[PDB]
Amino acid sequence: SSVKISPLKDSEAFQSIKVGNNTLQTKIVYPPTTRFRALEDHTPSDLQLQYYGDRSTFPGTLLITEATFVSPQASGWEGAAPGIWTDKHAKAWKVITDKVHANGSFVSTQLCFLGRVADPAVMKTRGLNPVSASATYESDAAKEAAEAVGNPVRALTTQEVKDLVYEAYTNAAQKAMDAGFDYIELHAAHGYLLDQFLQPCTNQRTDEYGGSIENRARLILELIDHLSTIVGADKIGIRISPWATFQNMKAHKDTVHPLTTFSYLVHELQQRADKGQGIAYISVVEPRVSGNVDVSEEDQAGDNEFVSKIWKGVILKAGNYSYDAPEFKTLKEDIADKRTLVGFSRYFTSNPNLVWKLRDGIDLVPYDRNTFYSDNNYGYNTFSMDSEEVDKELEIKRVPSAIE
Amino acid sequence: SSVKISPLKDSEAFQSIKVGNNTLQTKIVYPPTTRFRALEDHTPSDLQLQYYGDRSTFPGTLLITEATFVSPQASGWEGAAPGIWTDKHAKAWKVITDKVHANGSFVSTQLCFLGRVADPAVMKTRGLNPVSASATYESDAAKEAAEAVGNPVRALTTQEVKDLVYEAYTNAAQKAMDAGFDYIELHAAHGYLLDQFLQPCTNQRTDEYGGSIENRARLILELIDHLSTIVGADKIGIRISPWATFQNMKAHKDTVHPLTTFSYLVHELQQRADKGQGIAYISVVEPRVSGNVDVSEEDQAGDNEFVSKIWKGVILKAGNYSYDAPEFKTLKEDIADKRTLVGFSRYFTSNPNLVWKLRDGIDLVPYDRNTFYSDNNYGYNTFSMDSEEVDKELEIKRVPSAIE
Numbered sequence: 110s111s112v113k114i115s116p117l118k119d120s121e122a123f124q125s126i127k128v129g130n131n132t133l134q135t136k137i138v139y140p141p142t143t144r145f146r147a148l149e150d151h152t153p154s155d156l157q158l159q160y161y162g163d164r165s166t167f168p169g170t171l172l173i174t175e176a177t178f179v180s181p182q183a184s185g186w187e188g189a190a191p192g193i194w195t196d197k198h199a200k201a202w203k204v205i206t207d208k209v210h211a212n213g214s215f216v217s218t219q220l221c222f223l224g225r226v227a228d229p230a231v232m233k234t235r236g237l238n239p240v241s242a243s244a245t246y247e248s249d250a251a252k253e254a255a256e257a258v259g260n261p262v263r264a265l266t267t268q269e270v271k272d273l274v275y276e277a278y279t280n281a282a283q284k285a286m287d288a289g290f291d292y293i294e295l296h297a298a299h300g301y302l303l304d305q306f307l308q309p310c311t312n313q314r315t316d317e318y319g320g321s322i323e324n325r326a327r328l329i330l331e332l333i334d335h336l337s338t339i340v341g342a343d344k345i346g347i348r349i350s351p352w353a354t355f356q357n358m359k360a361h362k363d364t365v366h367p368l369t370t371f372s373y374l375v376h377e378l379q380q381r382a383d384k385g386q387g388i389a390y391i392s393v394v395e396p397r398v399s400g401n402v403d404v405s406e407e408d409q410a411g412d413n414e415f416v417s418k419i420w421k422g423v424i425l426k427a428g429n430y431s432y433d434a435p436e437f438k439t440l441k442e443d444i445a446d447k448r449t450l451v452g453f454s455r456y457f458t459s460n461p462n463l464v465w466k467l468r469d470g471i472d473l474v475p476y477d478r479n480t481f482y483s484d485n486n487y488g489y490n491t492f493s494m495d496s497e498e499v500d501k502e503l504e505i506k507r508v509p510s511a512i513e
Numbered sequence: 514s515s516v517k518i519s520p521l522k523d524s525e526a527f528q529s530i531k532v533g534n535n536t537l538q539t540k541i542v543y544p545p546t547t548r549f550r551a552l553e554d555h556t557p558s559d560l561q562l563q564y565y566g567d568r569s570t571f572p573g574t575l576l577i578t579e580a581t582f583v584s585p586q587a588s589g590w591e592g593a594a595p596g597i598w599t600d601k602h603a604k605a606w607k608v609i610t611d612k613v614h615a616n617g618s619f620v621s622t623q624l625c626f627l628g629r630v631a632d633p634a635v636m637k638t639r640g641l642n643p644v645s646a647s648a649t650y651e652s653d654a655a656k657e658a659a660e661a662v663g664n665p666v667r668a669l670t671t672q673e674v675k676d677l678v679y680e681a682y683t684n685a686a687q688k689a690m691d692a693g694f695d696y697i698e699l700h701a702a703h704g705y706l707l708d709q710f711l712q713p714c715t716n717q718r719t720d721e722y723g724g725s726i727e728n729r730a731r732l733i734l735e736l737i738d739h740l741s742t743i744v745g746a747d748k749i750g751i752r753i754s755p756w757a758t759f760q761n762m763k764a765h766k767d768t769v770h771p772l773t774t775f776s777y778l779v780h781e782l783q784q785r786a787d788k789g790q791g792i793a794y795i796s797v798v799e800p801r802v803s804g805n806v807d808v809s810e811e812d813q814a815g816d817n818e819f820v821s822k823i824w825k826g827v828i829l830k831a832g833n834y835s836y837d838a839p840e841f842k843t844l845k846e847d848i849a850d851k852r853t854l855v856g857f858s859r860y861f862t863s864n865p866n867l868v869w870k871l872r873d874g875i876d877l878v879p880y881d882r883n884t885f886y887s888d889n890n891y892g893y894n895t896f897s898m899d900s901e902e903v904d905k906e907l908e909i910k911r912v913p914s915a916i917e
């Protein structure tokens with residue numbers, strides 16, 4: 110059903126805030142949202158250009174791109190997700206960042222790497238193995254699937270982990286700058302590669318990158334440090350999901366509790382800020398949501414208050430913020446400290462003008478989960494059109510094409 | 514009476530436009546509007562800080578400051594107008610431009626110089642004479658007033674005209690950059706100094722700065738050229754009022770018609786643009802208004818179509834644009850070419866949120882001419898408050914004070 114909402118115009122959500130070297134004019138953010146409308150070779154498409162453009166119209170909005178692969182080894186979905194490792198990728202993304210910028214808005218790219226959850230058949234076509242901190246699978250079914258095609262998950266060697274820092278993420282960061290991105294965001298959430306390194310259920314390494322809380326965090330902090338020297342700390346973000354059990358992360362049932370793991374990481378980030386190397390923002394997923402799934406109040410085992418107590422800079426929070434609509438009591442509490450951004454993913458899919466709707470209390474159009482991950486324009490850019498002009502069958506047939 | 518208006522949200526008025534090196538998100542502009550709420554020594558005041566801040570809230574709005582004196586010799590009003598010639602002036606203005614910038618908006622400073630209309634008693638206190646291109650007065654009364662205090666208008670010498678370029682306007686431009694202004698605008702309108710040079714009723718010089726159309730334009734083009742080498746052409750604007758008879762400019766009754774004078778100037782500006790030295794914008798006053806006065810359709814002797822035909826860059830037009838409210842037929846025609854900005858001065862005085870009102874068709878609050886030029890906060894920042902919280906007598910007593 111459509112969601113009745115009270116206007117946020119006079120709230121902290123429309124007070125300006127400096128994030129790194131840019132100033133946002135709204136604290137409402139579009140978080141990274143995988144949609145699979147990139148081209149087959151992972152170049153961003155004509156559909157994506159319009160999609161991000163349509164969401165940039167409140168001047169001074171921050172948009173964060175869907176998970177974007179840092180390298181071929183970083184990939185592994187059957188759906189067509191974008192990349193940022195070739196000149197072709199960067200040039201196409203630049204058309205998109207140009208369009209967002211022309212509206213006075215800003216864009217961060219979420220750099221991802223799937224790791225142990227990469228599809229083994231897909232990776233086999235690249236002549237690649239699924240890789241991770243350790244040789245583990247999210248399920249027995251995944252293990253059987255990988256071994257059945259003779260392409261098991263394997264642990265990255267120490268040198269390969271160094272390669273992530275000095276090659277894969279370095280090149281991705283360089284391409285991201287070529288592409289005109291205002292920030293790069295390390296995806297360290299939701300059980301993908303960086304989360305696999307951070308937490309013990311996924312990392313049993315015996316080199317410098319595992320075997321202790323500090324060792325497990327080492328790769329992530331090494332990426333933060335190295336990339337800061339390339340692009341500047343003011344252009345860096347990171348996303349974490351301490352409480353999530355998406356893709357079989359054990360979370361509060363792990364041998365090290367998320368409060369320990371993630372407080373360690375956040376405090377190390379704050380110590381860098383104290384030394385003049387403060388990253389632009391930390392993005393955190395609220396315990397109401399785990400990956401792309403809502404979590405019952407019953408199953409919630411912690412909260413993200415620790416991030417606020419430990420980190421002094423900008424925080425982006427997201428996860429079912431309309432649960433207490435129309436009055437948005439929780440959203441208002443969460444932004445009261447004046448350094449907190451609030452993200453809406455699912456409602457931004459069906460409301461390209463979401464910032465405007467939230468500003469003036471306009472009923473939210475319900476989203477369509479059925480078309481979250483499909484391969485064509487129906488349920489993608491169609492939310493920007495009047496229905497009477499949406500030819501559904503034509504749009505279902507409209508697959509992504511090259512920009513211009 | 515309050516003005517009913519139709520929403521401009523879906524019009525060209527909310528399409529982005531690059532002006533010099535900045536992109537505006539609305540084409541609605543606040544034009545230079547003298548209000549006399551600066552400090553006695555011409556430093557910008559606490560009241561001005563709030564006043565410009567209040568008008569910057571639609572992100573990506575261009576605000577142009579009230580006439581701002583380039584030097585002591587440039588002054589001459591009894592009211593307290595601001596200046597931009599000392600470090601103190603620049604530092605105070607920087608607080609204001611900082612505030613506008615934090616809202617994602619931009620600010621141009623209108624550089625002025627009164628010339629022959631400077632009050633002779635005021636100038637006598639500075640040990641200065643009123644000066645001009647030639648020794649003329651706007652009226653016999655002005656002549657009698659100046660001679661009665663033994664302080665006649667006098668013609669600037671050739672060297673003094675050079676001093677305007679290399680000293681007065683050079684320093685003002687430098688201070689404007691220190692103050693964080695995005696543009697500097699030469700006031701060549703309304704019968705002030707630069708207009709006095711351009712037109713023959715006010716300029717009978719026999720040196721290189723008078724005696725022909727080209728010679729009369731020489732100072733203005735010399736300022737454009739010299740200041741372009743200092744701040745860049747992308748940071749320069751100019752205002753002209755071809756049809757105005759404000760302060761006794763003869764206009765269409767002069768010995769050279771405004772179409773001749775101003776087409777010459779605009780074409781010279783376009784030739785500079787063809788060579789890569791295109792200034793950011795030309796601001797023109799529509800024939801509906803002369804200075805601060807409306808002009809009857811009967812008395813209108815020309816239009817500004819020539820500027821559009823000759824100049825290929827950004828044009829700002831202003832002058833009673835709400836005359837055909839609610840539908841704004843003329844405004845819409847004028848912005849249809851996609852390179853034209855539209856200014857509202859008088860309605861911006863009583864509607865600090867004017868861009869927002871025009872966007873969504875909110876009734877315009879009528880302005881109060883009685884408080885256009887008074888010395889205190891009543892009728893100045895009071896338009897941003899709810900009435901029930903406006904203590905009128907306290908506000909009348911609130912004169913400008915130092916920022917912070």
Ligand SMILES: Cc1cc2nc3c(=O)[nH]c(=O)nc-3n(C[C@H](O)[C@H](O)[C@H](O)COP(=O)(O)O)c2cc1C
Binds near residue numbers: 141143394430455
């Ligand atoms: C279809 C879909 C795709 C998503 N893709 C990503 C992603 O690529 N990276 C990421 O960090 N989170 C991703 N998420 C999680 C969202 O960014 C967000 O945290 C979550 O949906 C909760 O916010 P919401 O309640 O406003 O939707 C995705 C969520 C959905 C529903």
Ligand SMILES: Cc1cc2nc3c(=O)[nH]c(=O)nc-3n(C[C@H](O)[C@H](O)[C@H](O)COP(=O)(O)O)c2cc1C
Binds near residue numbers: 703885
């Ligand atoms: C009180 C007042 C002060 C003004 N001050 C200036 C000024 O300093 N410089 C200038 O170029 N025009 C000045 N103008 C002219 C305006 O910028 C504008 O061109 C004129 O008012 C017509 O626009 P409007 O009908 O929207 O008010 C002033 C006008 C008024 C009414």
Ligand SMILES: C=C(CO)C(=O)OC
Binds near residue numbers: 143221299399
């Ligand atoms: C599609 C999801 C859902 O959380 C994801 O995080 O992709 C990186």
Ligand SMILES: C=C(CO)C(=O)OC
Binds near residue numbers: 803
């Ligand atoms: C106050 C006016 C009215 O046009 C003026 O132009 O000041 C520079």
Ligand code: NA
Binds near residue numbers: 165166212
């Ligand atoms: Na737009």
Ligand code: NA
Binds near residue numbers: 213527529538
């Ligand atoms: Na825009």
Ligand code: NA
Binds near residue numbers: 443444
């Ligand atoms: Na908070």
Ligand code: NA
Binds near residue numbers: 569570616
């Ligand atoms: Na503001």
Ligand code: NA
Binds near residue numbers: 123125570572615
């Ligand atoms: Na703002």
Ligand code: NA
Binds near residue numbers: 821847848849850
């Ligand atoms: Na036009």
